[PDB]
Design a protein around this ligand. Structure first.
Ligand code: SF4
Ligand code: SF4
Ligand code: SF4
Ligand code: SF4
Ligand code: SF4
Ligand code: SF4
Ligand code: SF4
Lengths: 168, 762, 762, 168
């Protein structure tokens, strides 16, 4: 039940993200054309790092390790690259950005382990000045995303991540 | 003397330079709101870059909001300067010569912007009048239907930023000349900073604000009444720096103390230590009277800007005000008379100290246990916390007898009590955290060097060549507020990491306070570990918030004194020189206020990039360049005029980082400038690569774009990097002599002179 | 000469008078937002009057937002004044004596506030410098953590309002003295206003903005090139009033035309009539270039405040700019040279008129039918309409062949095209409405009297006794913007209803334009039906927005010239006199802008109540008194000092009405003042009761609270009202002589002098 | 179905009114202790005037006729009094206001026939600085009310009003 609690302290406006279940998020990630996995330093928690690695490996998703989360991906066998999150949000709005690997922009970004007040400010520009889709699979309900999980506890977040991995 | 093309600039006078800057560093807009609410045609929904009823779109509205923030910060600094200058002229006189230190360019920002070289105090009035006029025009531009394009709003924001720098320079020059401040002293005295440095057995005066004139009158009364050793006067925010700099050209330690930043105001009030609180100016909490009347702490206002809804007893007798305060008729008063305030505040503290004994908001152990047991874990406090602290988990741990979670939360918390107003159990979460960390609070002591002021010309000549060539890895200006994302130690970690690598770290404001609060394993602060001159490996503190003009003028003077340029009305040329040659970067890890935005924008207009904390994305505007595009990184050679390619550095003008490790990497990378020699480039590349491997775990992906010669590579790891260039990028290196024969795109020319302007190019 | 106690006032100087005002008229706060977004600690949820991270609550934040709006309006008027004065001094000279008309008090607001009596043009510079200084201080107060109480924000808002009035007075005085404006002429020429007054077979220049400096240059070029009868120059907003007042002291009709208010800008652009659009300053749409490039309408900016993102060709040759515009390289340019602009704009219109023939955004009949048939009635346009017009119903009617619904919607619409950006069928709703009302648009013509300027002292002597005693029912100042709730005819209806009852109706700004657009059954406008002097039954137009200072100074001169007070530095005494004796009320039925808020606040500080439209609740702050409480309506007698009860009038200082009928009733009731004689009270009560019965259907419930004598009752219906007092309220009236013997609570004393101040009471 | 469409152009904040059915609104009006019926000039529409009169008569609700809607209540046998809507909102926040009849303040106000941008600005103060409840029974969804009908067409508004009258 990732769609129950969608409480916010403050609101950006009338528009808000759609609360989704694990099945819907799994379908959206599996049917994505050119997805990107944007992860902040919050992913370095041991219970989140293995889940993120398994999600990325299950679908061969390139990883944008913003902040200082890159050290948690060096040993793993994934395609992860460092980029400043603000610069990544600026570059996603440019249609002719070559991308991290130089093969074109991305149409869907999966967000995990981010500070609410930071990912929300990046997603504001991303959603208002581009056509990229955003799926927040974190434990905080993100308003500025396109699709997002609701407010969850850490145990519930882990269970939801396992559910998403099962259907991936 | 010679004059530049832009004296007393306006919006149209600086539009070409701003457009040149914005061609490279495109403005990224991060709207804080989907709606505009300026006029009654609205509120207008602008989601999707739609337009309002006036025709303005989302980008324009975000630019207008950022411009309003910048002009607000400029207004604060300018009003401070005007009030200070008027008081100084009324007391000391306008014929008093300016005494900033040992230098010839007394006012670098003023000379750069207005083309003036003031000699006495009276000469600073026309500068203030021009600043007020330009502020009026810029504020008029805020009206509905006054500008349609976002780029012109950005240009006007740049103009407001440089006006803010001029105002700060005026204010600091006036106060240093008049109040006997240290005159560019490399060795100014160390002062005590911290909540635990206050002796609570004595009557306590607490000064909050930024203006120090009334504080100086109180200090004069305390000194001439021999009350320095019988009372304790502490200050919060930049007014603490100002009082600790007062009459310290004799270089003896001060007796006034520094309590902390804005984050410590409510914690200090709740502790019950203060006996009388006197507020002066900006950065003052609005609930001081409500939270102080519970603990019987009187509040005295001293400025018209912050009256605080208190009664105005300015003309009333001091003893009458004391008696009404003691009886409890009023929680405080407004005193606009400086002599009367200086007499009243110490006497009020003296007569209030025996009345309020043991009064505090800190819960008792049984009370704390009951408050912890009251919680039901509904999660509203965590939702309402600006820092997203896991309050319910800490309280759940406290229910079991463990208080380490709340103790850890204490440093991250900014003392805003936004969590207390959403709890349905009425749990004083801030007080609970303070009770849990009462030992660490008692141990909160540290040392900070007093505000030295500006940088003298001799040090400028000593360090100019080192800085322009890169022998010194660069200047890190750690400034700004205390809205830190993950505690107050990040600035200390960054400052230590960059002082260990022989950078020039210049600090000011609340960040200097937070840097001085932490000691090493032995027990010394960075200020006593490293000297306080202007040279490699030295951390110097310029002073209060208005002292950032000294850092900007230090960059100006590096451009002028060394390279022999003319400052007068020459903003574009000096800014281009600073952007192309001087390796200076600023850092505001906890910026929240409008003054921070104004200072950052002014630094940008002068050509100084800036890193900011994750909370600074709420400013709605950054300046980021596109590295993949190659037409953006092209300049002209000043000797002839041909097209010259430059490395993508700095890659931004304003950016926000997430963690302090990434901030360290960004600061190391953004000190790289064109026109660096082989040794300077080698040093900067070494530091950048080492920091990237240490914090991020990888060698930077675009490290090869900054290599023009085999001497550009680090000397210690030259061979492995040459092999990497040979393999990864398929370059051509001659292994017989270990030299680069083919591969680099920008050839190395020692006498190349990169410039962004063709008018002065020959 | 004698000086009052408050020359060059600051926030602390006027705090007692503001507190006296707020004791009676409590500030009602209507927050437009549940959150504050000023700094990066936020956004802070303040729902339920909670406090933010800085400690500021909902009431404080709403007060700060209103204060920011007021200072923005003050800044606009002050910047206009400074630019105008600088240009005037640079051209004509600073030694030029001020020529406002036939009076001795040339600058009433200036003398009242700063205690100065300027004689030449140079004497106005120090006033502007003081205004800029105070604006800087007030804008500095906007910073986070700079004020905690809402009442002090309200005091600073009053100070900003009176500063705004001073700035408007300076600007209007300078332009009237220099540009040959009519000098207090009761018989100023009638000028043509309306969209349909423009001859579209000629080259058309359209001037938008408020500054006329550049326009006057264009007019000089047209006059000396004998192009007045070959071209057509029209203006929108207050710049139209300024150009139609240019050099009209000779009292001959002007040749420039008035097109309409801000609501007409996009409609006129979409019609395709304009050939060249030139924009100067505030009240200019931000989508002029985007909507004009579709119809090949070039845009020329002429001020640094609005540079519109266009290229700056100020130093380029005129012919090069003309050729670049003609070829289509650029949609316009910025021209900061006044001679060059005055040459360029007429030539550009001349060379663009033959190029764009028949180009318009108005749909064809078949295109209109297809667009109407495209709609699916989803209701997003109605949701997005600021006026909540039933667009889907009008389109559904249009599908069946009926276009009366859209024609009716045309007048209510403000031409903002906020409905077009939410339609998924891409229907140009604004253009559809314009097509449906193309006949009514073609019939849109009218007459408006030119801006006379200030009111001479002779008329002040003539009307002072009648106004103070109540012989004249009062002054209605119909001013403000064009954000009307239900069309532009409401101001006309109110003005006619009050001119028929012999009020003194003074108009200015867009409201005068909208009043002059409607004719009676015969075909005459109110301006030609009623004379334009300052007396009962006369509607006079002061001019542009900066002319409201003339209405405020007319109230100040009624206080000074008649009662023999001293204006110099005497804001409190003069404002108290105006509040207690002068029956003046203002009406801003369509106020949206920040200048409107500043003007209203300045009028409130001077003691003039104001009614506003339903959209003005978005300003977040009204000033309303409590009628049920009796301690609020108590003053002191100026002769002795005893407590004197006064009727609850005015019952508000700023209020918002819903419909124009209720607005008429409120204006009639709020002209009642204390110290009215029996005849004046009889007249005011008669008008109030008659309007209440006509528009609300009932006799006012509290009508008896304004009766002190049997002569106070209306003469025609004295007996029935006496019987009502006898029955409903159980009073005691002697039927033998038809006199009131018992029942009134306030006795009638002819020589009673009600005052709110005890310092000048004896 | 008065709880389906609750769309807004702009949002005042996170807090919003609860969309209710005709049964819930009828119960709330019938169980009110001291209700007030605030009506604007929009009630003068012939189909709304009789409905408002019947609602007020069914429960003896005093009427505050703000704006210029008073002429539509003079002939009927209801207790209606004129008051400026802004002044009424100011007076409702004062706990010691005697009221229209002088018998004390009101705990519930029923709102009908109001402009959205005007009633919303009055209700902002009413809900943020008082404890009065507000029930909007108009055809526009009001955010700042406590309980409110959703967006409705005129025919649906009339049908909902008849449903409320039936259960009154
Ligand atoms: S811009 Fe700020 S004050 Fe205005 S509506 Fe948005 S959040 Fe509220
Ligand atoms: S300024 Fe423009 S966008 Fe903002 S509320 Fe007014 S009309 Fe709407
Ligand atoms: S708001 Fe109060 S009750 Fe709820 S989780 Fe926080 S401390 Fe516990
Ligand atoms: S007082 Fe501290 S814990 Fe409470 S909301 Fe503010 S920052 Fe968070
Ligand atoms: S100014 Fe105060 S209320 Fe507004 S966002 Fe900042 S901390 Fe919150
Ligand atoms: S938005 Fe377009 S389709 Fe929908 S009702 Fe309005 S005109 Fe019709
Ligand atoms: S253009 Fe007219 S009809 Fe369309 S939203 Fe604006 S006011 Fe309403």
């Amino acid at each position: 039940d990732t769609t129950k609690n969608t409480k916010l302290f403050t609101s950006y406006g009338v528009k808000t993200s759609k609360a989704i279940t694990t099945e819907v998020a799994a379908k959206l990630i599996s049917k994505a054309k050119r997805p990107l996995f944007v992860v902040g330093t919050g992913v370095l928690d041991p219970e989140l790092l293995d889940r993120a690695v398994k999600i990325a490996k299950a679908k061969n998703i390139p990883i944008a390790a913003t902040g200082s989360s890159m050290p948690g991906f060096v040993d793993k066998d994934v395609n992860a690259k460092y980029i400043n999150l603000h610069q990544l949000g600026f570059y996603l709005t440019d249609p002719d950005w070559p991308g991290l690997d130089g093969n074109g922009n991305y149409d869907t970004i999966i967000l995990l382990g981010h500070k609410k007040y930071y990912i929300n400010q990046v997603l504001s520009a991303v959603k208002n000045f581009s056509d990229v889709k955003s799926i927040s699979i974190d434990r905080n309900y993100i308003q500025n995303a396109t699709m997002s999980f609701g407010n969850l506890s850490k145990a519930d977040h882990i269970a939801a991540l396992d559910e998403v991995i099962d259907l991936l | 003397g010679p004059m530049g093309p832009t004296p007393f600039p306006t919006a149209a006078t600086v539009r070409d330079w701003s457009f040149t800057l914005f061609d490279r560093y495109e403005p990224v807009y991060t709207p804080m709101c989907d709606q505009c609410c300026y006029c009654t045609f609205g509120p207008c929904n602008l989601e999707g870059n739609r337009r309002g009823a006036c025709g303005l779109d989302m980008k324009g509205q975000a630019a207008r909001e950022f411009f309003l923030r910048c002009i607000t910060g400029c207004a604060c600094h300018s009003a401070h300067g005007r009030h200070l200058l008027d008081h100084i002229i009324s007391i000391f006189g306008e014929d008093m010569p300016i005494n900033m230190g040992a230098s010839n360019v007394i006012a670098p920002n003023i000379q750069l912007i207005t083309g003036r070289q003031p000699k006495t105090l009276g000469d600073l009035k026309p500068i203030m009048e021009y600043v007020e006029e330009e502020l009026g025009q810029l504020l008029a531009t805020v009206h509905a239907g006054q500008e349609g394009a976002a780029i012109d709003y950005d240009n006007k924001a740049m103009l407001a930023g440089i006006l803010d720098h001029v105002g700060m320079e005026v204010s600091d020059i006036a106060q240093v000349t008049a109040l006997g401040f240290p005159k560019s002293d490399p060795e100014a005295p160390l002062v005590e900073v911290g909540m635990g440095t206050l002796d609570a057995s004595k009557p306590v005066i607490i000064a909050i604000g930024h203006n120090v004139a009334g504080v100086t009158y109180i200090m004069d009364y305390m000194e001439d009444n021999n009350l320095t050793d019988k009372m304790e006067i502490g200050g919060l925010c930049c007014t603490a720096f100002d009082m600790t700099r007062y009459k310290r050209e004799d270089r003896k330690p001060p007796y006034a103390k520094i309590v902390g930043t804005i984050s410590k105001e409510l914690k200090v009030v709740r502790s019950g230590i203060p006996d009388v609180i006197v507020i002066d100016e900006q950065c003052v909490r609005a609930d001081l009277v409500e939270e102080g009347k519970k603990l019987k702490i009187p509040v005295i206002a001293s400025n018209e800007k912050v009256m605080y809804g208190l009664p105005d007893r300015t003309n009333d007798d001091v003893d009458a005000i004391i008696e009404d305060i003691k009886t409890g008729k009023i929680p405080g008063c407004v005193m606009l008379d400086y002599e009367k305030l200086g007499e009243l505040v110490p006497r009020l503290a003296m007569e209030m100290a025996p009345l309020r004994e043991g009064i505090s908001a800190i819960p008792s152990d049984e009370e704390m246990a009951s408050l912890v047991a009251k919680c039901v874990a509904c999660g509203e406090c965590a939702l309402a916390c600006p820092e997203e602290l896991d309050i319910p988990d800490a309280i759940q741990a406290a229910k079991e007898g463990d208080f380490t979670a709340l103790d850890f939360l204490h440093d991250l918390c900014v003392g805003c009590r936004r969590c207390e107003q959403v709890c349905n159990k009425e749990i004083p979460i801030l007080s609970v955290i303070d009770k849990a960390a009462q030992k660490a609070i008692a141990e909160e002591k540290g040392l900070v060097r007093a505000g030295r002021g500006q940088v003298s010309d001799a040090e400028i000549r000593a360090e100019g060549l080192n800085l322009v060539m890169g022998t010194t890895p660069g200047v890190i200006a750690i400034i700004g507020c205390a809205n830190y994302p993950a505690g107050s130690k990040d600035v200390y970690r960054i400052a230590e990491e960059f002082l260990n690598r022989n950078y020039i770290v210049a600090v000011s404001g609340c960040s200097a306070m937070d840097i001085g609060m932490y000691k090493d394993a032995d027990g010394k602060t960075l200020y006593e570990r490293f000297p306080g001159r202007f040279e490699r490996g030295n951390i110097l503190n310029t002073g209060s918030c208005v002292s950032n003009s000294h850092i900007s003028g230090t960059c100006h003077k590096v451009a002028a004194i060394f390279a022999g340029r003319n400052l007068s009305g020459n903003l574009a040329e000096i800014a281009d020189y600073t952007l192309n040659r001087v390796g200076a970067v600023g850092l505001a890890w906890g910026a929240y206020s409008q003054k921070a935005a104004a200072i950052g924008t002014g630094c940008n207009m002068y050509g100084i990039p800036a890193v900011l904390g994750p909370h600074s994305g709420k400013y709605r505007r950054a300046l980021i360049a596109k590295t993949y595009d190659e037409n953006k990184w092209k300049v002209y050679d000043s000797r002839n005029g041909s097209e010259l390619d430059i490395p993508p550095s700095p890659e931004f003008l304003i950016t926000t980082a997430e963690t302090w490790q990434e901030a360290c990497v960004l600061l190391a990378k953004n000190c790289i400038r064109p026109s660096d020699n082989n040794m300077g480039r080698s040093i900067k590349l070494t530091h950048w690569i080492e920091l990237s491997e240490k914090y991020l775990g990888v060698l930077p992906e675009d490290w090869w774009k900054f290599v023009r010669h085999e001497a550009d590579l680090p000397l210690s790891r030259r061979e492995e990097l040459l092999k990497k260039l040979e393999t990864e990028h398929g370059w051509e290196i001659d292994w017989k002599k270990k030299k680069i024969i083919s591969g680099p795109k920008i050839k190395f020319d020692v006498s190349s002179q990169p410039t962004n302007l063709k008018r002065l190019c020959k």
